[PDB]
Amino acid sequence: KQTELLKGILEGLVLAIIQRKETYGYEITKILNDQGFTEIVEGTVYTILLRLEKNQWVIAEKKPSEKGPMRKFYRLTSSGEAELADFWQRWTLLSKQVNKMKK
Amino acid sequence: KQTELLKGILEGLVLAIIQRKETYGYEITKILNDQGFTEIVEGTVYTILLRLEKNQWVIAEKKPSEPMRKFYRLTSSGEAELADFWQRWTLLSKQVNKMKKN
């Protein structure tokens, strides 16, 4: 259920992380891990990032790292920002509906 | 993405619903729609109930309704599942809300 529970949400959180700072898979996975979605590996993030790029919600581009090798860095498009705004609203509603069941 | 958003969650909501009342498929789909939870067709509830039976988190019995319908109660393993779901949900939304505020 924990992989299932993270479906839909993780895409939203990934968009969220990219909005805050230009970033690449390892950075994104490490932030998620520290927040702490600890059982999320970068293989899962990579898969998600492919899909985000495919739909042009994020742009991807390679720059040098600290310190040396190239890395694929991401940033939100205007459509992406729109998708993220939509995620939080949908989430805020869901979160309310589901919590109104807890008690 | 709403379909993917309900994944995991929906199963627990059904578990939670069955706990608070002994009920049937058509009705569970309705209680969910009146929540709601508008994208939920009955087939989605029927697929979940079959899986909850298979894992023995619920038991079912045929009874009359206010027509003979298939009525579900939670098992004790099912009770632990619901309880485990709330624990993890509480944690998940605490973490998700913390990232919105950031």
List chain A domain ranges.
1-103
Chain B residues near residue A99 by CB distance under 8 angstroms: 93
H-state helical runs in chain A = 2-6, 9-20, 25-33, 42-54, 78-102
Phi (first) and psi of residue B86, to 5 degrees: -65, -40
Method: X-ray
Q: Provide the CATH number for the domain formed by B1-102 in this structure.
A: 1.10.10.10
Chain B residues near residue A90 by CB distance under 8 angstroms: 1-2, 5
Phi (first) and psi of residue B68, to 5 degrees: -75, 125
B65: closest CA of chain A, how far (Å):
24
Give the single-character DSSP code of A70. E
Tokens of B99: 């990232």
Of B4, B12, B96, the CB nearest to A91: B96
Q: Give the resolution in Å.
A: 2.7
CA distance linking residue A85 with residue A19, whole number of Å: 11
CA distance linking residue B98 with residue A35, whole number of Å: 8
Give the single-character DSSP code of A57. S
CA distance linking residue B8 with residue B44, whole number of Å: 12
- In the CATH hierarchy, which top-level class contains the domain A1-103? mainly alpha
Q: Is A9 exposed, middle or buried (0-12, 13-18, 19+ CB in 10 A)?
A: buried
Indicate the SS3 state at residue A79: helix
